[PDB]
Design a protein around this ligand. Structure first.
Ligand SMILES: C[C@@H](C(=O)N1CCCN(C)CC1)N1CC[C@H](N(CC(N)=O)S(=O)(=O)c2ccc3cc(Cl)ccc3c2)C1=O
Ligand SMILES: [Ca+2]
Lengths: 53, 232
């Protein structure tokens, strides 16, 4: 297990391997955080989240 | 849905219900965005609307909304005898206002979904369909965890062809499965508390029969097609 095969490469969502390196990305409506791994909602009711209010 | 449990408040917000002229549900769908619904091509056989935000069809909650359909976009390669290319996208006349019990499911990227989502132990299917093969449809929205099934095993168990556009999920003997009226509805896969669309409820030889599984349209084979449909 290497890169994306090892715990999703530490990415919150999409993991891609480029030139022996992990590159993370996010679904539409999320922006990649400063650490280049976490996915942050841009607005209210982001996709894929159960609703709490 | 045979077996499983009720979707609790806010748990299945991407569920849509296609309703006929008598306000009765005949098929499901998945909310993809404020303007688009994903469903099964076979469900499109004349005049119907789309209901969202419903969990109990016998009570007025206050979250429910009916939407008219502006355009029906059916896959042109859909075949009635095999149910191959069983996929359609609907554009609504007015946008859906997201709220409690009304939100979209995420579309994943193909490669990641196939290596990481479809290799998970289970997916989740949901609907207002029959609660057993020869019963009535449910007045309550239900959900069920369904294991991904090995592709070779599925082909061996099936009396009808399993194309490259289909995959199998469910149980060998346990009494849990999707059923009549669930067709066109969501099969989603959870990953780090985010739910991605992985399938469309398509067909099966009865409901929860021994040595038989649920057959779903393979969404990952249609991601470019879905993207094109949602632009024009
Ligand atoms: C084989 C397939 C059928 O008639 N086909 C499929 C391919 C075979 N060709 C020859 C005809 C069409 N069939 C047989 C009957 C069955 N139902 C449809 C119906 N109108 O009675 S069902 O309601 O029992 C049903 C529907 C959807 C399901 C989805 C899942 Cl994931 C699991 C169980 C389901 C049960 C149904 O779908
Ligand atoms: Ca209701």
């Amino acid at each position: 297990r290497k890169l994306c095969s090892l715990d999703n490469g530490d990415c919150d969502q999409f993991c891609h391997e480029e030139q022996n390196s992990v590159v993370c990305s996010c679904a539409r409506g999320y922006t990649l955080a400063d650490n280049g791994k976490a996915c942050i909602p841009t607005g209210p009711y982001p996709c894929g989240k159960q609703t709490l209010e | 849905i045979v077996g499983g449990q009720e979707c609790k408040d806010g748990e299945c917000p991407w569920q849509a219900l296609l309703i006929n002229e008598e306000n009765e549900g005949f098929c499901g769908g998945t909310i993809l965005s404020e303007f688009y619904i994903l469903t099964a091509a076979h469900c499109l056989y004349k005049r119907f609307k789309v209901r969202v935000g419903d969990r109990n069809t016998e009570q007025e909650e206050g979250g429910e909304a009916v939407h008219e359909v502006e355009v029906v976009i059916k896959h042109n390669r859909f075949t009635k005898e095999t149910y191959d290319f069983d996929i359609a996208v609907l554009r609504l006349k007015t946008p859906i206002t997201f709220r409690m019990n009304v939100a979209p499911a995420c579309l994943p990227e193909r490669d990641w979904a196939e290596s990481t989502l479809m290799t998970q132990k289970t997916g989740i299917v949901s609907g207002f369909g029959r609660t057993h093969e020869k019963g009535r449809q449910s007045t309550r929205l239900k959900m069920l965890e369904v294991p991904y099934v090995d592709r070779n095993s599925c082909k061996l168990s099936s009396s009808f062809i399993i194309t490259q556009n289909m995959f199998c999920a469910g149980y060998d003997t346990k009494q849990e499965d999707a059923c009549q009226g669930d067709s066109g509805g969501p099969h989603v896969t959870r990953f780090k508390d985010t739910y991605f669309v992985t399938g469309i409820v398509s067909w099966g030889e009865g409901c929860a029969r021994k040595g038989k599984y649920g057959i779903y349209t393979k969404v990952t084979a249609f991601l470019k097609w879905i993207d094109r449909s949602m632009k024009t």
